[PDB]
C-alpha cells in the first residue's frame, strides 16, 4: 500500500507551474530536484525554475532555488559532479547550476548555434564511469549531442538521428540500460521506439518499432539488476492511454496495459523490484503494477487529493518511495509498502516465468 509521506509546494516559485521533470541525487538519495516551466500568471517572473527539496529535514522551504530566462523542460543531477545540476530548456540551451555559487542564474549555458542544440531539450543524462562520464542531450529536432560537464561551449559529439529515408525523429524521451553507455533507447512522438547507438560503425538509429499509435510520453529501461538479467526489457507510456512492455530482441509488443481511462503520462521501473513498475496518468492516478503478482490489474493505486493531473514520476534509488509532480507545481511523495517494494529471492524467477508465459 502507498502511504502519503511528504508534500512539497513553494507558494512564491512553484505556484501555477507544471512539474516538468524529476530526479534523485545518487550521492544524496534524500535530495530531489524538480523542474518548472514558465508561469502564464507571472510573465515578469523567470520562466524556467528548478527547485531542490530535501527529505532528511522536515522543513517545507525549498533547499535550493534556481531560475533561468528559458522554460526548463528537463533537469537532473550531475552524478559525478555533486555540486552541479544540469537542465535542458525550451530554447535548447543546456543550462547548468552550481549550488556553491550564490547566483541563481546558470553559471553555464550552451550556445544554441548550429553546432549545438537548436530546439527544446526534453532529455538529458550523465552516463559513464567515474573515470569517464558524458552528458547526452537530445532535442525535439532529433539532434543528439554529447557534452563534457567541464565545458559546455561546444559538444563532444553531435549528429542528427534518422531511421529511414532521412526522416527526422522528434525525440520526446530517452533511456539507457544499466551499465551501458554506447547503446541507448529513445521514444519519439511517432509512437515508435528506436534502439540507437551513440558511437561506432552503426552509430544512429538501429531499429524501428511500430508499437504505440500516439505520442510516447516516457520510456524507461529496466533498472533492477540481480540473478536474471532484464536490462533488455523496457517500458513505454504514451498519449494513447496504453503502457507497453517491450524487449530489445522482439520487434513487437510483449505486452500492453490499457486499464487506464486517461492519457498515461509516465512509466518507470522500480530500481530494486524486478517485476514491479509504476505509472502516472493525467486523471490523477498513480498505479503500481507487479507483473509477478499480476499482469492484469494495478497491484496498488492511489489518487492525489483533488485528482491533479500527474505529469512526472521518479522512483527513489532505494525503491521504498515514489515522487510525483503534477500540473500545479506540487510534489507528492508516497512510501511503498515493504511487501510490494522489497523483492523476495523468487521474484526474479517469478518474473522470468511470467515473461516465458507471455
Amino acid at each position: 500500500k502507498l502511504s502519503l509521506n511528504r508534500q512539497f509546494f513553494d507558494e512564491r516559485w512553484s505556484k501555477h507551474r507544471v512539474v516538468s521533470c524529476l530526479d534523485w541525487s545518487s550521492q544524496y538519495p534524500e535530495l530531489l530536484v524538480a523542474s518548472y516551466n514558465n508561469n502564464e500568471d507571472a510573465p515578469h517572473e523567470p520562466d524556467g525554475v528548478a527547485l531542490v527539496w530535501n527529505m532528511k529535514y522536515k522543513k517545507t522551504t525549498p533547499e535550493y532555488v534556481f531560475h533561468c530566462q528559458s522554460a526548463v523542460m528537463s533537469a537532473t543531477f550531475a552524478k559525478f559532479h555533486p555540486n552541479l545540476v544540469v537542465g535542458g530548456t525550451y530554447s535548447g540551451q543546456i543550462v547548468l547550476w552550481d549550488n556553491r555559487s550564490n547566483k541563481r542564474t546558470p553559471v553555464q549555458r550552451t550556445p544554441l548555434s548550429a553546432a549545438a542544440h537548436t530546439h527544446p531539450v526534453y532529455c538529458v543524462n550523465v552516463v559513464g564511469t567515474q573515470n569517464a562520464h558524458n552528458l547526452i542531450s537530445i532535442s525535439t529536432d532529433g539532434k543528439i549531442c554529447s557534452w563534457s560537464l567541464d565545458m559546455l561551449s561546444h559538444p563532444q559529439d553531435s549528429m542528427e538521428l534518422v531511421h529511414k529515408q532521412s526522416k527526422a525523429v522528434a525525440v520526446t524521451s530517452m533511456s539507457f540500460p544499466v551499465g551501458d553507455v554506447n547503446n541507448f533507447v529513445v521514444g519519439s512522438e511517432e509512437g515508435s521506439v528506436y534502439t540507437a547507438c551513440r558511437h561506432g560503425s552503426k552509430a544512429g538509429i538501429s531499429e524501428m518499432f511500430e508499437g504505440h499509435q500516439g505520442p510516447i510520453t516516457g520510456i524507461h529501461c529496466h533498472a533492477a539488476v540481480g540473478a536474471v538479467d532484464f536490462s533488455h526489457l523496457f517500458v513505454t507510456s504514451s498519449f494513447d492511454w496504453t503502457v507497453k512492455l517491450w524487449t530489445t530482441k522482439n520487434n513487437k509488443p510483449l505486452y500492453s496495459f490499457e486499464d487506464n481511462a486517461d492519457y498515461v503520462y509516465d512509466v518507470m521501473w522500480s530500481p530494486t523490484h524486478p517485476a514491479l513498475f509504476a505509472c502516472v496518468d493525467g486523471m490523477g492516478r498513480l498505479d503500481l503494477w507487479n507483473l509477478n503478482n499480476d499482469t492484469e490489474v494495478p497491484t496498488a493505486s492511489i489518487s492525489v487529493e483533488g485528482n491533479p493531473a500527474l505529469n512526472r514520476v521518479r522512483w527513489t534509488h532505494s525503491g521504498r518511495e515514489i515522487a510525483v509532480g503534477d500540473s500545479e507545481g506540487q510534489i507528492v511523495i508516497y512510501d511503498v509498502g515493504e511487501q510490494i517494494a522489497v523483492p523476495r529471492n523468487d521474484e526474479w524467477a517469478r518474473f522470468g516465468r511470467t515473461l516465458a508465459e507471455i
Binding site: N131, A132, H199
Partner: protein
C-alpha cells in the same frame, strides 16, 4: 579502462598546450585503439583552443617588427 582513467587524470593535471601535447605523446601506442580516440575527441576542442592560444602568442612575437625586437639586438651582439 585503467589507462583511459589515467588519461583523464593526466589532463586533469596539465593545462598548457605544450604540456598537454607532451602527455598526449606519452601514450604513443594508444592511438591505434578506436576507444581512446573518443577520449581524445572529448578534449579535442580544448586542444585546438590551446594550440590556438600558442599561435596567437607566436603572432604576437611576429607582429613586433624584427629591428625593434630584442632578437635583432642579440643577433647584432653575435655579429649576425
Amino acid at each position: 579502462t585503467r589507462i583511459t582513467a589515467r588519461l583523464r587524470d593526466q589532463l586533469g593535471t596539465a593545462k598548457n598546450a605544450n604540456e598537454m601535447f607532451r602527455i598526449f605523446s606519452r601514450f604513443n601506442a594508444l592511438f591505434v585503439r578506436p576507444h581512446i580516440r573518443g577520449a581524445i575527441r572529448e578534449y579535442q576542442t580544448q586542444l585546438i583552443q590551446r594550440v590556438k592560444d600558442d599561435i596567437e602568442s607566436l603572432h604576437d612575437k611576429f607582429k613586433v617588427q624584427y629591428p625593434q625586437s630584442q632578437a635583432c639586438k642579440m643577433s647584432h651582439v653575435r655579429d649576425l
